[model samples]
Target: NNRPTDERIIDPSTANTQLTGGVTYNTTSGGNKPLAGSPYGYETWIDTGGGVCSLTWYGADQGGGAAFKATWTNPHDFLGRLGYFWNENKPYSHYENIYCGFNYTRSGRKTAGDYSYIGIYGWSRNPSASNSNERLIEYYIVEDWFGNQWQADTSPMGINTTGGTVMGSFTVDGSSYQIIKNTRVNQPSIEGDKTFVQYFSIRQSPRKSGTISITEHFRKWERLGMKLGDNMYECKFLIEAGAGEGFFDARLIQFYRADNEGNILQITPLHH
Candidate 1:
């Protein structure tokens, strides 16, 4: 009998789910505090303080992942990077009904190329070593400072560049976006194999500040043949800074799941 053991019977209203605080790693410091527990029992990552970047958790009792804050300094040396990662290998098919949103703002010593973003990032790949092809997609809710300077990648290994031709444009949650389809072949993979296509969706007019649904964009891309993958892993909400030095405060209001009826089922945690 081919019983679907992995098929999760998720209850939208009463599922035993909550936000969690991911792990915090300090680049400068050797010993960092360990994470306690999380909602989905997924591995979480975040940078605490004293290092270049500092993260503070508000606790699940205060709504958990929605209760965290972060700040960072800069250097060619690197102050640090902040991320709220969930180590779950979810399939793209499972994302059709899921919706995620958050809030954030940037301030202090900002310059060209210096930007901060809050978005969903993940990897798609095959199981076998030889066919361990992977694709990395960084979908952003907001990418301040470098919003207008969107460019295509000249080198194959480069990131943040326009990888392919313009598919078209659309509006999501009242915000407009330019849909670009770029592909990179033989790119680096964790298994050290070559990934054939690295697709990207670069927002022409970046969202500086607002509450937007990430799933809405996903639905639109799916209609445009944006193939995420059969197996998606390491899905997370990450924040990054480029060469320029600047700082910002990000507040994850809620990362929740829903049913086909759009009813909120479980509030996914950032990590505890």
Candidate 2:
């Protein structure tokens, strides 16, 4: 289950190098960024279910139609992100044949220090929270990432320069991923100040656009002993990045259903 495919991408030591960025994201002067608000149906819900859970300020671009852009530079060292949450009102389990569909364009010329992920990210608490109290878990299913060494491998399966347990091969949507888990001790999360397991499936082949069959990954993780919480704090299409200068402009970010045949159902949104 091990391939040399880009392990540094998930290197716990270097991953999320700027964990404090979450605090910046949770900063709230409120209303909108710079006291600005969105009318085009942009919902700014930071896991604000707790943990200084405030509205994320700065430029994560929470826009309508679920489309937005995020850019970072010199004043970097913070994790910036934006997306739609599947919590409270519309819980994640309500859907049957759904996937996160996206089409994004990235711009950057980095020698190093750049990291990012586009996938399903959220928090979950263990049902056994009674004695354990807080296994409060946050996980990710990385669909795409970029950089010279990030996707540097030219083999059939690209690599991310990692030095950990590459573990297993997760092939989906015409690509493959290396399933890896890391522990974020005392890192920022929904409640904040608690250690937790951060499950991940980093794609080997980075695509320009694709569908992430979310349910499958959850099921697969369960098979791997990566238990999930019965109660979901939040789940959404997240674009998280930091530690360098870069930019990502997503043109399409939406939830869609697929039929039994595995073909997309309903009209497809053009990603020109």
Candidate 3:
């Protein structure tokens, strides 16, 4: 029942070094990239030599629902972060709804000080409705230690330094998440103008491999007075590394909306 109709192979060397797919994948040395035709992109930061982290991006390939794969390898003390990003122009509307799932596997020898998560990045405007004071929200759907690798900063069972406080907790698709909301002052506008109150929901346990219905999670947030903002843009999944080394991989099994008959509907990008 799940099959991809389009696919492409992307090599990281050809990607734009500065930006791609509405996110900045830049380090002191390593880089990030995306597939050419994918609605979203995947890759890991890779290092050229010893001294820095490395990031790499492998574009979409033939698989269930437009699949993209990525890998990150760190050696000689270098580190890397692997993940995916969506730069689509479609704004979430009340009239439209979609369901998404990820079939993924995460494994590798990770040392201390390593972290990984799957989440979304977006902007929420402040009360002033100005870009200069917009807030950038780095919301995580889930956070976990790859390979059950230990992290030194696991006080209260997690490390959260985004100036946000735990608003509450909720359960979605049989998984629990701690909802977090933070207020930022003046932040840079990469995706667009944002707000001061940023929101996030972190999963209680690390979701290694499974099918998660994301629509349920969104609905749960709305019930708690947490809106997706006036414009809900850029829904991405990412993995980050602080110091230790490991690898991350994910396959977007299916990301699309459906009609009453359960037929997949093509979503055209809206022009901003």
Candidate 4:
């Protein structure tokens, strides 16, 4: 819970400080940045599986959507312990929904946006301070495949300015991401609305059949040509995200592949 809020919006006079996830670091600082690679560790199976892994990328309007945010060291505490879902809403009785659902519409058997978040000791009880028990029922829907489209507009739910923990432990080890600190930014032309944080510490393996690696971060979008990451694993980002204007289109794609012992696969693709 570190709330410096990007240093009070890069210090406006430093008071109410604002930095919504859509854009803020005082409006992209040394912009046009995209060669920032290496630090891939993609494998978030969430268990009790039916399916829910995540990592997809795209940008031009923040349209694909994916920025859950919480990386200051991000060593898990993800809403007080891995979303702390101990049999409550009981999705199949114990595990299945952490959140993030999409299909890319136009008639593909669309799925509802299950991107939930209400596990703050709902009935599991335990809170007393006039019940500061805290509440954060999260929301962001857009269901549409055929059932006649569903919608629930609301974004920005504790994406970390620091609180509970400022993301502190990110280890990827394969494509390499020991990352305790070192964000490398010399600058050549990059500029848009600066505020690009990092932290992805993982050590997953509650056992789900071993073999999970996909970490690839490559970008050069004017039209997506720059050899295209040696020919398509995929990567792109160009967001000032404002031309006609509505805002929500997001970006941050990372997909690396390797794991038969090849061990170097990372995936974190938030399509918008």
Per TM-score, the best of the predicted structures is 2
User: Which candidate comes out best when scored by lDDT?
Assistant: 2
Over 4 Å off, model 2? 1-64, 75-77, 89-94, 109-114, 129-134, 148-165, 257-272
Q: lDDT order of candidates, best first?
A: 2, 3, 1, 4
- Rank the candidate models, highest TM-score first: 2, 1, 3, 4
Global lDDT of each candidate = 0.43, 0.49, 0.44, 0.19
For model 3, residues 102-176, the per-residue Cα lDDT tens digits are 454445444413444444333332223344333233344554444334432222234343356777887764567
Candidate 3 — which residues are off by over 4 angstroms?
1-34, 42-59, 65-90, 108-115, 119-136, 147-163, 185-195, 251-253, 259-262, 267-272
Q: TM-score of model 1 relative to the true fold?
A: 0.62
Look at candidate 4 and tell me the lDDT of residue 222: 8
On lDDT, the stronger of 1 and 2 is 2
Which candidate would rank higher by lDDT, 1 or 4?
1
> lDDT by residue for model 2 over 87-177, one digit each (tens)?
4533344444556556666664342144556566776666564434346667777776545444441222223333234457777767777
TM-score of 2: 0.64
User: lDDT score of model 2?
Assistant: 0.49
lDDT of 1: 0.43
